Structure 1
Amino acid sequence: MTEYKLVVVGAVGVGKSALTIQLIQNHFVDEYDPTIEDSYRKQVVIDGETCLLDILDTAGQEEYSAMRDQYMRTGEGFLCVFAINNTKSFEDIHHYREQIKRVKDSEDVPMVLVGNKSDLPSRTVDTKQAQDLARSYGIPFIETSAKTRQGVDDAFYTLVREIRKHKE
């Protein structure tokens, strides 16, 4: 069976486990829990093929810099999640971008920019603005409304399509 090794990156206040738990057990949690390390695995049927998705939810802080540069060597699919309400987490993508290209040692890497809390009234970053920077890097921007569970499942398939095309 085809297994996909992905890492869940981001900052504190975006919705890390809010995406995982919502797609894994279909549950939305209001309380935020500072995660350090764990393994989330689930089987998904795409294009008639059943595959296993292994996602590692690491600390959403620049605490373990050495460890950050470690797992970044596996650039299968980077989930660039940010909060549309927090511009700081959006402009933080560049901070990771400069490192990603260094660790991956490749200019071309299939990544997906997903904005969370899109169903929330508090919006600072606009879709066009987000897409402006996204297209600057060469990555697509998707809307991920966690609370309503809209686009969360579909957006997960988009990255798989990228990985498949990056192969052959």
Structure 2
Amino acid sequence: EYKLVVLGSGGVGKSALTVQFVQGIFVEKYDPTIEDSYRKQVQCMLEILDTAGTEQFTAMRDLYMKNGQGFALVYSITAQSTFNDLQDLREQILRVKDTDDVPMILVGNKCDLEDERVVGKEQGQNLAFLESSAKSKINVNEIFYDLVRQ
């Protein structure tokens, strides 16, 4: 039993990465109301706790942070503001569970589209760094692999 959390601002691709990992878009219909909606056995069982659609309710992310063990700080490489929103979420993790060190990974989603890219690869490297793409299936599984190892 493992519990991983996906964090970031809206329009980043959190939900797209979550579905694409647990089941996959299109190939099967996605029902988010059943028991195994966010659980995937990969050997170990992983539950993905995603803040997508509930960002306005800060209590939801805190509850997820409390129950979380691995964390994914995701941003869009086409959005300047989204990279700047990551600093606060990083701090908030080390407050709810009251710890010193926490297993986490930084994620740069939407790496497929370059003619709209305003955020380079360099910036995320200084702060685990991955340039993933939910729709192009790039590095989708890799994100959740690092967290179980840590």
Equivalent of 2:44 in 42, 48, 51: 51
Distance 1:68 1:150, change over 3 A: closer
Q: What is the Cα deviation at residue 54 of structure 1?
A: 1.0
Distance 1:79 1:21, change over 3 A: same
- Whether the 8 Å contact between 2:51 and 2:61 is mirrored in structure 1 is no
Alpha-carbon deviations, 1:142-166, whole Å to 9, x = none?
111222212111232122111xxxx
- Structure having greater relative contact order (Cα 8 Å, sep ≥ 6): 2
> 1:27-42 counterparts in 2 under 5 A?
27=25, 39-42=37-40
Q: What is the Cα deviation at residue 141 of structure 1?
A: 0.9
Distance 1:24 1:71, change over 3 A: closer
Distance in 1, matches of 2:45 and 2:39, equals 7
Where does residue 144 of structure 1 map in the other structure? 132
- In the alignment, structure 1 residue 126 sits paired with structure 2 residue 120: yes
Distance 1:43 1:106, change over 3 A: same
- Structure 1 consecutive aligned stretches of length 4 or more whose deviation exceeds 6 Å: none
Partner secondary structure for residue 78 of structure 1: strand
- Whether the 8 Å contact between 2:69 and 2:103 is mirrored in structure 1 is yes
- Whether the 8 Å contact between 1:145 and 1:152 is mirrored in structure 2 is yes
TM-score, length of structure 2 as denominator length: 0.82
Unaligned runs of 5+ in 1: 30-34, 45-49, 135-139, 163-168
- Whether the 8 Å contact between 1:84 and 1:115 is mirrored in structure 2 is yes
**CA RMSD, 1 decimal:** 2.2
Q: What is the Cα deviation at residue 96 of structure 1?
A: 1.1
Unaligned runs of 5+ in 2: none
> 1:15-164 counterparts in 2 under 5 A?
15-27=13-25, 39-44=37-42, 50-60=43-53, 62-121=55-114, 122-132=116-126, 134=127, 140-162=128-150
Partner amino acid, structure 2, of 1:43: Q
